């Protein structure tokens, strides 16, 4: 039940709520007040989904889907079989995610480490909240939120995107995408570079970080360094998500026409709007 080096770290302390009341583990898992909160929220949420499944009349995971209130309910309550369950499951999800982040903070404090991890996770939570809470509220109805189902949530992405034409033309979406692709690129290279150093050609000694800098300067004329790469992966992945949330929060609110038409502002600039030739003359 313990890693060989684990015991010296399992001291008391670090909790945010409850003093020593929940300061303990179950197998590998730390508990804490927020472990209890997470269990409660997640448990209710899952039970409510299983109840929503009965009211839908299916048990197949590819078919279970919990849809938010239809648009006519606005921002109000809805009968359970018709949107109410979604609404309660969403409060449960939120409670679970935030509890999970706060439990991570208790773990950081016990371990004497920086808070970077729950801080990073809070970006994902902010993205979920943009879709299920912030955007629907600004738009005036819960029904603009995505439904909880494996394929139905995809139907929502497709339908929502094509409401605005080819969603590729959302410029915040272009930036988000660029961060996603760049992040995967940098993840590949970081993993590969560390491993190429740690696992050199047969019979050779482990290479050093000096070799890692060298390899990347040889290759592209720069190396960000070992601190920098971890700063970078973190920045790229949080930026991707910041821009994801941004790209959606602005859609259906400040911009609601076809995203491709947004780009006319540049073509219509007085200096060149009226010169013939090219694509737009």
């Amino acid at each position: 039940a313990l890693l060989s080096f684990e015991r010296k770290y399992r001291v008391p302390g670090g909790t945010l709520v409850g003093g020593n009341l929940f300061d303990f583990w179950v197998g590998p898992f730390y508990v804490g007040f927020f472990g209890v909160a997470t269990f409660f929220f997640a448990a209710l949420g899952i039970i409510l989904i299983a109840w929503s499944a009965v009211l839908q009349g299916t048990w197949n995971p590819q078919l279970i889907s919990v849809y938010p209130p239809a648009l006519e309910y606005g921002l109000g309550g809805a009968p359970l079989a018709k949107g109410g369950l979604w609404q309660i499951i969403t409060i449960c999800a939120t409670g679970a995610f935030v509890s999970w982040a706060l439990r991570e903070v208790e773990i950081c404090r016990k371990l004497g480490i920086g808070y970077h991890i729950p801080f990073a996770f809070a970006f994902a939570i902010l993205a979920y909240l943009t879709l299920v809470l912030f955007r629907p509220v600004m738009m005036g109805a819960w029904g603009y939120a995505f439904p909880y189902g494996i394929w139905t949530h995809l139907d929502w992405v497709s339908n929502t995107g094509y409401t605005y034409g080819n969603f590729h033309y959302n410029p915040a979406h272009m930036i988000a995408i660029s961060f996603f692709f760049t992040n995967a690129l940098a993840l590949a290279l970081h993993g590969a570079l560390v491993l190429s150093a740690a696992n050199p050609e047969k019979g050779k000694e482990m290479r050093t970080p000096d070799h890692e800098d060298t390899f990347f300067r040889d290759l592209v004329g720069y190396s960000i360094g070992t601190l920098g790469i971890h700063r970078l992966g973190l920045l790229l992945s949080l930026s991707a998500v910041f821009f994801s949330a941004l790209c959606m929060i602005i859609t259906g609110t400040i911009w609601f026409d076809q995203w491709v038409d947004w780009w006319q502002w540049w073509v219509k600039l007085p200096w060149w709007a009226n010169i013939p030739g090219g694509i737009n003359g």
Partner: protein, 302 residues
């Protein structure tokens, strides 16, 4: 407020770092570039040296030729007018030959010939660049992980511009060179194949793309959270585990009930990343060669 190690508070500099020698032909290395204090807030201040070499030159010349061929066509589409060039920059497009030319090299310059020439240059640029990622590791005695990883990106690329067109019987299936047009091509590809959301390899590619950001956010944040114990010195933590690697593993064991090592996180990393383009390339390559309509295929599972 405590210091968070996102940006450095104090930079230091010493003699330009010329790098490890090992088996590298030193005649082929530039001098050092300048030193960017701006960069140094976040990463290393030093630029260069870079390695040149014969393959290097070839790859760069080829890459330029690809870039210039597209840009020449763009200027032409702009009727040589600077103002129209900038106005319409994202709208220009160098397009592959029409279906009727099939796989032949016999289309006119203005109607696909130029596309093939640009593509030719892109092909030698990328592959000789691949050669360089292998060769620069070799000369340093390092593993070949970078070149193996790069090969997975190359695979989606080769599938899109080369292998899928060949299997379909025409260059018209390939992607055009343009900012907006490559996007239109992408949206169209999905429409014409019954919605890529029903392609299991597209959904896998997404799981991995999102998984990469999840994992890089996790790893990057973890290393920074343990940088106060020297956590980013990962190679020496692998050789001689410290309290950084242990606090890191235990953060995760305690949170989610399992954990990595300092070396093995890097393997979860490389694989999470390469599988984006591995599964992606497969999903595209199957699209239209074997499966005409993902929604249809999905209804039969087979």
């Amino acid at each position: 407020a405590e210091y968070q190690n996102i940006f450095s508070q104090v930079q230091v500099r010493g003699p330009a770092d010329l790098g490890m020698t090992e088996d590298v032909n030193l005649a082929n290395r530039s001098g050092v570039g300048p030193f960017s204090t701006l960069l140094g807030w976040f990463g290393n201040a030093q630029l260069g040296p870079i390695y040149l070499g014969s393959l290097g030159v070839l790859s760069l010349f080829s890459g330029l030729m690809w870039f210039f061929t597209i840009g020449i066509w763009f200027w032409y589409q702009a009727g040589w007018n600077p103002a129209v060039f900038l106005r319409d920059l994202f709208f220009f497009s160098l397009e592959p030959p029409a279906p009727e030319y099939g796989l032949s090299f016999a289309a006119p310059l203005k109607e696909g010939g130029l596309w093939l020439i640009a593509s030719f240059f892109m092909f030698v640029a990328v592959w000789s660049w691949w050669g360089r990622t292998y060769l620069r590791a070799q000369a340093l005695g390092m593993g070949k992980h970078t070149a193996w990883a790069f090969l997975s990106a190359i695979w989606l690329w080769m599938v899109l511009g080369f292998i899928r067109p060949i299997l379909m019987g025409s260059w018209s299936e390939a992607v055009p060179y343009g900012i907006f047009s490559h996007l239109d091509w992408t949206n169209n590809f999905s429409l014409v194949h019954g919605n890529l959301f029903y392609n299991p390899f597209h959904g896998l590619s997404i799981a991995f793309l999102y998984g990469s950001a999840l994992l890089f956010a996790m790893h990057g944040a973890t290393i920074l959270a343990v940088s106060r114990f020297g956590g980013e010195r990962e190679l020496e933590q692998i050789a001689d585990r410290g309290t950084a690697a242990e606090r890191a593993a235990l953060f995760w064991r305690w949170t989610m009930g399992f954990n990595a090592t300092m070396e093995g996180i890097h393997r979860w990393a490389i694989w999470m990343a390469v599988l984006v383009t591995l599964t992606g390339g497969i999903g595209i390559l199957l699209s239209g060669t074997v499966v005409d309509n993902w929604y249809v295929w999905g209804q039969n599972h087979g």
